[PDB]
């Protein structure tokens, strides 16, 4: 996806301030709490009875790291998101069978997490640039449906 230099700057500058051990599990956690049908694909992870359960859950925090790992990757490869996510698409599409609307939702939840953590720093132009990113990532993840 085409980010302008000011868009790239807005994303990169904020992304270096991100606690990569935490934001990932926060975004994934919130997704399971806010959109409870997403918990269908995670019965294994244990106590998802409550928000505190989900948020204070190891397998969520563990897994959100990789999830966050994925977004960082594609942030280096807006030119080749399809090439970047190739493998993982067959995973969520051919193997897991997940609707692409759900990738858009995770992306939006990640944006809410970024706003929560950065407050005033997460200005409307910075959000706009992050929306292009998560849109491009969601689309590339869904290429095995397209």
């Amino acid at each position: 996806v085409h980010l302008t230099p000011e868009e790239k700057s807005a994303v990169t500058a904020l992304w270096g301030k991100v606690n990569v051990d935490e934001v990932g599990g926060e975004a994934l956690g919130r997704l399971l709490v806010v959109y409870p049908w997403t918990q269908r694909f995670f019965e294994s992870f244990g106590d998802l009875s409550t928000p505190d359960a989900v948020m204070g859950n190891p397998k969520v925090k563990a897994h959100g790291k990789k999830v966050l790992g994925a977004f960082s990757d594609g942030l280096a490869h807006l030119d080749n998101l399809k090439g970047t996510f190739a493998t993982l698409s067959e995973l969520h599409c051919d193997k897991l069978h997940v609707d692409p609307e759900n990738f858009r939702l995770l992306g939006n939840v990640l944006v809410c997490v970024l706003a929560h953590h950065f407050g005033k720093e997460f200005t409307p132009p910075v959000q706009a640039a992050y929306q292009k990113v998560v849109a491009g990532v969601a689309n590339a993840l869904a290429h095995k449906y397209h």
Binding site: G29, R30, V33, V34, P51, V54, M55, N108, V111, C112, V113, A115, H116, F118, G119, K120, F122, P124, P125, Q127, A128, Q131
Partner: protein, 140 residues
């Protein structure tokens, strides 16, 4: 549906927003127009630049409608009746766009309420805004 918990969460959130309601509404509008440029076509006659008195004015109206919904949470279709008519019939707003404004309203709240915007409060606000959006799209 909105549980009693969701309702107290939403009331709590609006409580802390306080007199910043209108300003956050204007900000949410700006976030939407920048993030989702397609939404701009519904406001050809607005100046949508930053600091626009027209966005600011309209933000207050959006916030006032939301507050009226919160204040009458148990009878939103009645409370939001004229607004539903306006958006479906006269304005013909694509239903997809309510999701986009709702996300920007959530982003705006998150950006201003570090303490209130817990996972549980996030969830309740999402449901509240989805209920408003359901009402505003009921009259096609």
């Amino acid at each position: 549906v909105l549980s009693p918990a969701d309702k107290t969460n939403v009331k709590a959130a609006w409580g802390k927003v306080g007199a910043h309601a209108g300003e956050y509404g204007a900000e949410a509008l700006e976030r939407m127009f920048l993030s989702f440029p397609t939404t701009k076509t519904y406001f050809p006659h607005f100046d949508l630049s930053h600091g626009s008195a027209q966005v600011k004015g309209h933000g207050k109206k959006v916030a006032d409608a939301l507050t009226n919904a919160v204040a009458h949470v148990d009878d939103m279709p009645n409370a939001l009746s004229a607004l539903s008519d306006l958006h479906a019939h006269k304005l013909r707003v694509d239903p997809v766009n309510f999701k986009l404004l709702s996300h920007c309203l959530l982003v705006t709240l998150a950006a201003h309420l570090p303490a209130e915007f817990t996972p549980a409060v996030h969830a309740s606000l999402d449901k509240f805004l989805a209920s408003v959006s359901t009402v505003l799209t009921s009259k096609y």
